[PDB]
């Protein structure tokens, strides 16, 4: 998303975002189980 | 962004973003003094 620059920063951001998303998903599957 | 949840994660994202932006600004200032 910035060519080859800011690899470690882009990784960190990516990880934190994936975790917010994953945690929200878990909350939703507690809220509305199948 | 998400109320009071994910305080640490949002702080992390914000910081890394501010650092990317700072480096971009530095490069641009060197490119065009
Ligand atoms: C078009 C205007 C925007 C240009 C973006 C600024 C690019 C200049 C960044 C220069 C310093 C920050 O490099 P970085 O991310 O620590 O690199 C990681 C290691 N490499 C340098 C080998 C890739
Ligand atoms: C519809 C989508 C809603 C998603 C909301 C899911 C929230 C998930 C909560 C877990 C994520 C982290 O929060 P926490 O470390 O427990 O907060 C600690 C600080 N307070 C208690 C004051 C807030």
Author numbering:
A (entry chain A): 1 to 34
B (entry chain B): 1 to 33
Sentences from the paper on this structure:
LL-37 is an extensively studied peptide with particular relevance in human innate immunity. LL-37 is produced as a precursor protein in human cells (e.g. leukocytes or neutrophils) and processed during its secretion to the skin, lungs, or reproductive tract. The active peptide carries a surplus of positive charge, which is attributed to interactions with the LPS or LTA of the bacterial cell wall, and negatively charged lipids of in vivo cytoplasmic membranes. Together the structures in the absence and presence of detergents revealed discrete detergent binding sites at the dimer interface indicating the presence of in vivo lipid binding sites.
We obtained two co-crystal structures, both of which are dimeric with anti-parallel helix orientations, containing two DPC (LL-37DPC-2) or six LDAO molecules (LL-37LDAO-2), respectively. The two structures superimpose with very low r.m.s.d of 0.4 Å (for 67 Cα-atoms). However, the structural deviation to LL-372 is significant (2.2 Å for 57 aligned Cα atoms) and only the core region can be reasonably aligned. NMR data using DPC micelles confirmed the detergent induced structural changes at the N-terminus of LL-37DPC-2 with a random coil rather than an α-helical structure. Furthermore, the structural disorder detected in the C-terminus of LL-37DPC-2 is in good agreement with the NMR data. When we analyzed the crystallographic environment of LL-37LDAO-2 and LL-37DPC-2 (LL-37LDAO-2 with one monomer in the AU; LL-37DPC-2 with two monomers in the AU), we noticed a ‘head-to-tail’ arrangement between the peptide dimers forming tetramers and the higher fiber-like structure oligomers. These fiber-like structures were observed in both lattice types (LL-37LDAO-2 and LL-37DPC-2) although the crystallographic environment does not correspond to each other. The ‘head-to-tail’ interfaces are formed primarily by the hydrophobic residues Phe5, Phe6 and Phe27, all of which are strongly conserved within the family of cathelicidins. When we analyzed the crystallographic packing of LL-37LDAO-2 and LL-37DPC-2 in this context it turned out that one-dimensional chains are formed by hydrophobic head-to-tail interactions in both crystal forms.
